[PDB]
Amino acid sequence: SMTFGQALESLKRGHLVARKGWNGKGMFIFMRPEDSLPTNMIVNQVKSLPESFKRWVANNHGDSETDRIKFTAYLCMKAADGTIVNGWLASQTDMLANDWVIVE
Amino acid sequence: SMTFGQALESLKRGHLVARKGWNGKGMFIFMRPEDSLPTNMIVNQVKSLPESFKRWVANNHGDSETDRIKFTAYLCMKAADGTIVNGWLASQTDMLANDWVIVE
Amino acid sequence: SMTFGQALESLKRGHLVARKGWNGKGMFIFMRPEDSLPTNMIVNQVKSLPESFKRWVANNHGDSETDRIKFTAYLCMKAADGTIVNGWLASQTDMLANDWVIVE
Amino acid sequence: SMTFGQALESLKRGHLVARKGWNGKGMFIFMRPEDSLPTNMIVNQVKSLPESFKRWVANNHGDSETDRIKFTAYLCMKAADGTIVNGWLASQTDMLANDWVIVE
Ligand SMILES: Nc1nc2c(ncn2[C@@H]2O[C@@H]3COP(=O)(O)O[C@H]4[C@@H](O)[C@H](n5cnc6c(=O)[nH]c(N)nc65)O[C@@H]4COP(=O)(O)O[C@H]3[C@H]2O)c(=O)[nH]1
Numbered sequence A, B, C, D: 001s002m003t004f005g006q007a008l009e010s011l012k013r014g015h016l017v018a019r020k021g022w023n024g025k026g027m028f029i030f031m032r033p034e035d036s037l038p039t040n041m042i043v044n045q046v047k048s049l050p051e052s053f054k055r056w057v058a059n060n061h062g063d064s065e066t067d068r069i070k071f072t073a074y075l076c077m078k079a080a081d082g083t084i085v086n087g088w089l090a091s092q093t094d095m096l097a098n099d100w101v102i103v104e
């Protein structure tokens, strides 16, 4: 069994982790990596951003081929139902628990 | 000024919102949309997923051209420093505040 | 059939609320009220604070100044197991869902 | 120069911790301890609970049964403005950062 801090260090190394308290169900959390993207690609290609954000980027960067915007790493959950919940957050219980385990 | 609930309804409609308490700084939050992705593309194309997740998908879906996995909508923050924080979360203060405003 | 924003407005008015899927486990959330306490009370009376915090207050707030410290309102959950989780937080799913209901 | 996991272990041992960038504003987080309270006390004594919750306990827990209710440990923040934010939550950035420090 691990603390949440050990779970986090495992997540940073690319592993899948879970809490025993979740009682299996095929649930686990994982980390999606950071990347820095060109603003022109943000404006002209990226599907998964709302138009208001893309318009803001376009207004402040124009046609720049060199400007970039950093998208941070973040945690996600593969839920029991199979869906990926982007932006998983840790409850007080999760943060203080010592029942974390490695899934992969 | 708006409650967090009004801010959320604005976010669902694609707007950028902020709290006055943040004191400007060009900060705002926004919603990234939901999508359902083919598992073959998850395995063979998606860059922004860790290899452990991609290997799990490959082992359970193989070469399927029809299986899909849903990635939920989520909130993000465009921070003062210009970075996009994926998976923004609301503090108790944020949830209970009535100083939310529309940015765009 | 209530958004999270409407659930929050109901919580601010003292109700117990839940998402429909929680019914089987009987979970709900509620809001604990704000209060402002005098520094002497914090240092010498309040049991539910760690010694380091009481000590910080004593040394960074003379109780000779007449100062009070505000303890903010916050959300809590009555869990399936019957425990009270202080400091409940909303997942992306919870924030964007429209299946909230009033329990009382 | 501490991960969030090491910060959590220090919090569990009663310390006040912060991220380095918080120094200018003097913010820190701390853990409030768990306790178990008898139901009669919850219904008839505890001020810092809403009436609906006290009423729920009274009607879903006879105080004739000898039952106690556990109130979990949780994190809090001493904010820049000096207020105590009950139920502090960790952002993705906070969870993945390695700039945590012990304040006391
Ligand atoms: N709604 C939704 N769609 C998803 C999600 N994950 C993947 N997709 C879809 O899969 C496409 C390819 O993802 P990719 O290979 O990571 O290719 C991505 C990736 O390389 C990069 N990118 C965009 N946003 C981020 C981000 O927040 N973090 C990282 N690390 N890369 C990102 O930009 C490329 C193009 O992005 P898109 O045009 O959006 O193209 C995305 C998008 O249509 C998700 O969680 N939600």
Ligand SMILES: Nc1nc2c(ncn2[C@@H]2O[C@@H]3COP(=O)(O)O[C@H]4[C@@H](O)[C@H](n5cnc6c(=O)[nH]c(N)nc65)O[C@@H]4COP(=O)(O)O[C@H]3[C@H]2O)c(=O)[nH]1
Binding pocket: C032, C033, C034, C035, C037, C045, C046, C047, C048, C049, C071, C072, C086, D032, D033, D034, D035, D037, D045, D046, D047, D048, D049, D071, D072, D086
């Ligand atoms: N560990 C733990 N114990 C709990 C909890 N809820 C109640 N108690 C216990 O019940 C006692 C009485 O609570 P109270 O009548 O609300 O009486 C409280 C309340 O009036 C006030 N107070 C302290 N902290 C807060 C806070 O964060 N918010 C509010 N609104 N009042 C607070 O100070 C009084 C004395 O506090 P204590 O000496 O701590 O005394 C508390 C504490 O021993 C909980 O969630 N966790």
